[PDB]
């Protein structure tokens, strides 16, 4: 759809759309930018992730409202509308996963890009798992786990324990364990170990990096407070 627009113009419009809180537009601009076929810089990866996380975040909030009403009712209208929203959400997740598979991940060789994209792949399978029912859920859950695990293996080998991508990956994988995989003890252990290893590495950081790492570390602490 965006084939006639310059890559640089799509990126510029994605930034404008973010300022205007037009996240569907932002995601469409960034999809067009990915489909130009070039790798994405760090800033461009952030734009792609922010766009789709906002789009799917709105869909997830709406799905939860409708699912709650539907369960409180158990006419066809609530189920029909929940199903409509669910299909839209699944379509957005499939689109993101398609961009990762064609061809962002296979061209991502540096740890920062490859870990970032694999974390995204885990996240979007996780969002699919939130609405999945049955044995379909099982394979979707394994797909999320496998993506997160590969990202974790790379991040432990290639990034310091305070790296914000490494920290956010561990945070989200811990949420996967707690909320999706029914493994609260694994979630707690991962969050604790991540927090403790980051704490021990803070002395190496500049003031600005310290602010970034400690902010995410507090998110790990917030989850541990809720879980224990």
């Amino acid at each position: 759809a965006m084939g006639s627009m310059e890559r640089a113009s799509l990126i510029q419009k994605a930034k404008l759309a973010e300022q205007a809180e037009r996240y569907e537009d932002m995601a469409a601009f960034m999809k067009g930018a990915v489909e130009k076929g070039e790798e994405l810089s760090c800033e461009e990866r952030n734009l792609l992730s922010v766009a789709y996380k906002n789009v799917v975040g709105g869909q997830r909030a709406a799905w939860r409202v409708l699912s709650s009403i539907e369960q409180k009712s158990n006419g066809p209208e609530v189920r029909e509308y929940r199903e409509k929203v669910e299909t839209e959400l699944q379509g957005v997740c499939d689109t993101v996963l398609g961009l990762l598979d064609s061809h962002l991940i296979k061209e991502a060789g540096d740890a920062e890009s490859r870990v970032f994209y694999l974390k995204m792949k885990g996240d979007y399978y996780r969002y699919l798992a939130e609405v999945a029912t049955g044995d379909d859920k099982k394979r979707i859950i394994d797909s999320a786990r496998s993506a997160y695990q590969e990202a974790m293996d790379i991040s432990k080998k290639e990034m310091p324990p305070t790296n914000p991508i490494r920290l956010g990956l561990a945070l989200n994988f811990s949420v996967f364990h707690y909320e999706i995989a029914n493994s609260p003890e694994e979630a707690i252990s991962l969050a604790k170990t991540t927090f403790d290893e980051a704490m021990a590495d803070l002395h190496t950081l500049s003031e600005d990096s310290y602010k970034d790492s400690t902010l995410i570390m507090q998110l790990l602490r917030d989850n541990l407070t809720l879980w224990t």
Binding site: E18, S49, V175, E179, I216
Partner: peptide, 9 residues
Amino acid sequence: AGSIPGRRS
């Protein structure tokens, strides 16, 4: 339980 709030920047 909160995941990364990656809705800004």
